[PDB]
């Protein structure tokens, strides 16, 4: 992967010991060495509420959102709850005759965990008036960190400086098992891997190392040593295949959970790294951290490769090696470039602009006027000339209409919306009752449900036809007569695609008649001209000719039932377009290096 980190919100503050994300509200909570607690809207960069709780460091703070509470533990032996809507001290008691290090909140049950230097862990029931239900003994030193198994909240790990982790079920005075860590300086932190495909855990030590454990088989999977000083935390991101550690060396290390190699190192500049949080449900992939000098909120995306070519020859992409995933760049193509075959074109990168989301993909309007970037549930539309904004919104799919001034979406509820003039047509409705896999552009809006393909008239929305083919892609000719229906071949039983001719007349007649069969459409509007052999990875029409890439990486052309190979490349090659000026077709590889191939009989 190529991770990308955006610095959402940073606050210089006293030593930040505890830190937690609210799950619905864009709020980070922080517990300080100063006995003060803070609530920040990291998204509008505003301090909501802040309480002077104690003179003593408060080390553990967590959200119980469901009861609209914050819960915090200090060095005065105490546990205190507050309502954050009101700032009103709900509860305040003595929970251990020693420091309180760590707190865990039960996902569902009114159950709250606290770990202590008193050697013990303890269970607390709030809707039975905070009575101490069970006291877990066994550890022979400071209990640094408690953690519920997200997959089985009846059980929980506890990381201890006595060099062990101890998993217990709610009820037994004894542990199910006890994990000697080998980490001769002790465990500061423990975290569960959230996904059901691995029973992994993780620890972090003063001994500079991080350790991944299998808790079924009870064995050390891997040692991950980076850090130059004591490792403070190590956690699994809820959503990206990463581990995140932090430490007194001042750094944050983002590790890869598969290769166990450090993907990314950050020196936030707040000195020593104390504590960690990840937005519960991956929102913006937020992770937040606490330091000697304060806290930061970081969003983590990916620099996925994007490129759209325009008809007149302009390339536009996001990201890159020397650059950021959400920076936009543009480059012009001219027959200029000496026709050397398999070397990437050299062009001059001009800065074009920026965008607020992590692209997964990017695409010009048909006429090359506008650019749409799609990502992270959001779509955005920019002017290609001075990178001016023209539209934003949420979408699971975006497809451009012929006009180059209208489009269609699958929205946050999975329902097709149609915009005309950047300003939605409310009345335009296509009632789709199955689930919508996808959306295609071209001269009829294409909609994939089941192993089917529906074709609707752009202006009204009436089903022009339904094709019973499990399409991968749908690629139209520019003059609107031809279409190629690429087939998700799925074990080469069927042909890889089908040419179809579209009679618009046959549609319009069945339109006047009111004889459009709302299940199928119009049998006469679509005729199957040919079937295709080899698999199709991408493809452009150039008149009656279909230029296409294969999974053998070969470049072919199809014209009137015949497949002629034209070149045989040796990478993953994708088609970008056909410039007539340079009589040239243009290709892109996995690294966005652009190639040019020349075409004549």
């Amino acid at each position: 992967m190529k991770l990308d980190i955006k610095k959402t919100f940073s606050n210089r503050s006293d030593r930040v010991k505890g830190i937690d994300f609210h799950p619905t509200e864009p709020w980070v909570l922080t517990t300080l060495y100063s006995g003060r607690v803070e609530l920040w809207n990291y998204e509008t960069q505003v301090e909501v509420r802040s309480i002077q709780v104690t003179e003593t460091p408060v080390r553990a703070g967590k959200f119980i959102a469901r009861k609209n509470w914050i819960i915090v533990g200090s060095d005065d032996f105490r546990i205190r709850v507050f309502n954050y809507n009101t700032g009103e001290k709900v509860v305040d008691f003595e929970a251990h005759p020693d420091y309180i290090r760590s707190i865990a909140v039960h996902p569902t049950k009114p159950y709250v965990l606290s770990g202590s230097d008193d050697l013990t862990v303890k269970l607390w029931n709030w809707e039975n008036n905070w009575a101490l239900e069970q006291t877990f003994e066994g550890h022979e030193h400071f209990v640094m960190c408690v953690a519920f198994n997200p997959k089985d909240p009846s059980t929980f790990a506890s990381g201890c400086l006595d060099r062990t982790v101890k998993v217990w079920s709610l009820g037994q005075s004894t542990p199910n098992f006890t994990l000697t860590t080998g980490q001769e300086r002790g465990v500061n932190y423990v975290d569960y891997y959230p996904l059901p495909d691995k029973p992994y855990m993780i620890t972090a030590s003063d001994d500079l190392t991080i350790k991944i454990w299998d808790y079924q088989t009870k064995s050390c999977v891997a040692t991950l040593e980076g850090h130059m000083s004591n490792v403070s935390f190590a956690v699994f991101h809820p959503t990206l295949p990463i581990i995140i550690s932090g430490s007194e060396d001042g750094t944050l290390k983002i590790w890869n959970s598969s290769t166990y190699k450090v993907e990314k190192t950050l020196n936030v500049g707040l000195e020593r790294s104390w504590c960690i949080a990840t937005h519960p449900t991956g929102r913006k992939n937020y992770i937040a951290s606490g330091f000697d000098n304060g806290f930061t909120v970081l969003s983590l995306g990916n620099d996925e490769p994007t490129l759209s070519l325009d008809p007149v020859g302009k390339l536009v992409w996001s990201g890159g090696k020397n650059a950021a995933a959400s920076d936009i760049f543009t480059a012009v193509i001219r027959g200029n470039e000496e026709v050397e075959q398999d070397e990437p074109l050299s062009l001059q990168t001009k800065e074009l602009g920026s965008v607020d989301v992590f692209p997964q993909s990017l695409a010009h309007s048909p006429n090359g006027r506008f650019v749409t970037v799609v990502g992270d549930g959001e779509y955005v539309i920019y002017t290609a000339l001075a990178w001016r904004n023209k539209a934003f919104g949420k979408c699971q799919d975006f497809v451009w209409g012929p006009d180059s001034n209208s489009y269609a979406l699958i929205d946050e509820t999975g329902q097709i919306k149609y915009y005309k003039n950047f300003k939605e047509v409310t009345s335009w409705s296509v009632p789709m009752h199955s689930a919508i896999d996808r959306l295609f552009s071209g001269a009829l809006l294409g909609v994939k449900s089941d192993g089917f393909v529906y074709f609707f008239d752009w202006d009204n929305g009436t089903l022009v036809r339904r094709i019973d083919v499990n399409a991968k892609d749908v690629i139209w000719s520019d003059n609107g007569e031809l279409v190629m229906i690429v087939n998700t071949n799925s074990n080469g039983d069927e042909a890889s695609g089908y040419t179809l001719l579209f009679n618009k007349d046959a549609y319009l007649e069945a339109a006047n008649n009111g004889n459009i069969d709302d299940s199928e459409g119009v049998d006469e509007a679509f005729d199957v001209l040919y079937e295709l052999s080899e698999s199709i990875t991408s493809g452009k029409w150039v008149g009656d000719v279909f230029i296409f890439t294969t999974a053998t990486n070969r470049l072919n052309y199809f014209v009137g039932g015949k497949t002629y190979n034209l070149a045989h490349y040796t990478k993953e090659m994708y088609l970008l377009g056909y410039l007539a000026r340079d009589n040239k077709v243009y290709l892109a590889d996995r690294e966005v290096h652009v190639y040019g191939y020349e075409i004549s009989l």
């Binding site: 030593r15 010991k17 060495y33 460091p57 230097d117 400071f142 640094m144 400086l161 104390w274």
Partner: peptide, 8 residues
């Protein structure tokens, strides 16, 4: 030093 002190 013989004793570090996890008082932070």
């Amino acid at each position: 030093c013989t004793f570090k002190t996890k008082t932070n």
